[PDB]
Ligand SMILES: *[C@@H]1O[C@H](CO[C@@H]2O[C@@H](C)[C@@H](O)[C@@H](O)[C@@H]2O)[C@@H](O[C@@H]2O[C@H](CO)[C@@H](O[C@@H]3O[C@H](CO)[C@@H](O)[C@H](O)[C@@H]3O)[C@H](O)[C@H]2NC(C)=O)[C@H](O)[C@H]1NC(C)=O
Ligand SMILES: *[C@@H]1O[C@H](CO)[C@@H](O[C@@H]2O[C@H](CO)[C@@H](O)[C@H](O)[C@H]2NC(C)=O)[C@H](O)[C@H]1NC(C)=O
Ligand SMILES: *[C@@H]1O[C@H](CO[C@@H]2O[C@@H](C)[C@@H](O)[C@@H](O)[C@@H]2O)[C@@H](O)[C@H](O)[C@H]1NC(C)=O
Ligand SMILES: [Cl-]
């Protein structure tokens with residue numbers, strides 16, 4: 001480690017730790033900058049040379065972590081917990097967590113290499129027969145093909161190409177991750193991930209939330225299953241069984257907005273998917289980013305700086321290079337450079353994704369003056385929810401009309417049902433998947449799920465919560481969990497279930513604060529400077545204070561709460577129950593063993 005980057009001496013006491021943290025921050029900024037730079041160069045341009053570089057950068061960050069980790073222990077182990085300065089306790093708490101820096105050098109190299117290799121496999125896998133990539137090729141197939149056979153070919157090819165080669169790597173990564181975190185005193189990596197919520201009853205709190213949400217999901221599911229039965233017929237849809245996993249519009253069946261045209265109850269009303277209008281008008285990526293920016297400035301939040309426009313990657317490259325297409329937002333830790341990398345396509349759900357990623361940027365802009373350790377969300381769920389909250393105003397029919405995407409606007413109960421059903425396909429359908437992914441991964445890290453049951457345990461959970469089934473037989477050579485971005489890219493998942501709850505609590509608070517006084521689902525906070533100010537107080541806090549207190553100041557409660565999401569959806573909740581009753585549906589999937597047959601000509 002460079003001499004300039006190494007820790008000095010400080011006293012064993014709180015005045016020293018202040019000097020320590022100032023010294024640390026001053027060093028960490030440079031280390032973070034070089035890591036993030038090398039990751040960027042790789043993620044926008046996957047080459048062996050770029051992976052080697054990113055690995056050398058992660059090694060540097062491990063030596064940094066070890067030297068300051070060990071120094072923070074050596075001087076402050078007995079005293080840090082008792083500091084007067086609350087922010088200074090969280091700073092030291094972060095600095096003393098070693099992670100992968102607990103590994104000896106040889107295993108640090110093996111760990112850094114596994115991260116590179118898993119990311120490469122996921123982002124460069126192809127389905128051939130002349131080869132399709134996930135984004136945009138397979139995405140487009142899953143979204144707009146209605147051919148059982150075609151959709152099967154894409155689903156199977158993807159799962160096979162991405163998952164099978166990842167399995168041995170995934171195994172070796174799990175063992176090394178556990179070895180690293182167990183020397184920080186956690187039972188396993190999953191215990192370390194969970195500890196970010198600082199909540200003794202987290203697992204029980206999530207389960208209580210899920211029990212209140214499950215009836216809405218079960219009713220959406222049955223109604224959608226019926227729509228599918230009418231197109232695909234009795235051979236491929238079982239009205240008492242799980243839904244084939246390839247028929248819901250999306251490679252992971254995790255949100256259903258693309259099959260809106262099959263389920264829309266009142267087709268004579270304004271057409272609420274505005275994608276075709278966007279195309280007709282000639283919208284491009286950069287217009288989408290500008291319209292999103294304008295919503296933020298209407299709240300008196302910050303514009304995107306020059307460095308964001310000059311540095312970002314807003315389309316998939318044409319020049320041949322290979323890239324990580326899954327979207328992400330980048331803080332370089334120098335308080336100057338911030339970027340988005342997104343393979344943006346011109347579609348309405350992609351306009352939402354634009355807002356999602358710009359919400360992360362806005363968080364980085366607001367907290368850029370805190371000590372580097374506090375430059376995070378109050379919890380991870382808060383960071384994921386910011387952009388989603390604004391996207392809830394943007395997609396209201398009235399807002400779409402203001403921005404030239406919807407010609408007529410109607411205010412009547414049929415238009416409301418359409419609206420709430422479209423939003424349910426996006427928000428309600430997701431809930432079971434958002435909850436299950438880390439139940440799977442926590443079982444793997446704890447050893448409850450060894451490599452010999454990775455796929456068995458994955459499909460148990462897929463069926464149990466989502467009520468889907470794989471459309472072809474799977475076995476333990478398949479590794480279907482690894483065909484989802486966040487698994488090989490090692491991004492925790494429970495943050496999204498938390499986010500999907502929190503965003504409705506935020507929405508309700510900012511609508512009240514804006515002075516809005518009609519139905520929660522018709523609220524648009526656009527141009528409300530009072531709403532902007534309340535949002536800004538959250539963003540400016542970073543992780544400097546407990547999330548339960550940040551939440552209470554914002555919404556008036558110190559806990560996650562399903563009530564706002566339930567109030568938003570109330571009208572469609574009631575309507576879907578009534579429809580399913582009148583149609584004699586069976587809620588749930590009692591025929592749990594059922595799978596569809598192969599088509600005659602497969603493949
Ligand atoms: C779309 O329409 C709804 C429904 O509006 C009501 O019903 C219609 C059949 C007609 O009778 C309307 O003339 C009538 O308002 C609109 O929601 C309603 O908005 C008003 C405010 O604009 C709400 O009234 C307020 O009530 C609070 C206390 O709750 C008072 O302090 C205020 O002074 C104010 O009068 C009314 O409750 C609300 N109805 C609800 C909640 O269902 C809706 O705003 C409109 N949407 C759009 C986008 O225009
Ligand atoms: C993608 O990454 C490679 C490095 O892996 C970049 O290639 C280097 O390009 C510079 C300038 O053209 C040369 O001096 C080097 O010799 C190249 N290295 C090689 C080929 O090993 C490439 O330019 C990157 N593409 C971008 C940034 O668009
Ligand atoms: C696992 O499955 C592999 C791929 O074949 C698939 O499984 C058969 C049984 C069909 O029903 C269909 O889904 C696919 O063709 C096999 O090649 C492999 O041998 C299977 N078993 C093991 C232990 O890997
Ligand atoms: Cl998380």
Ligand SMILES: [Zn+2]
Nearest residue numbers: 356360383384
């Ligand atoms: Zn995100």
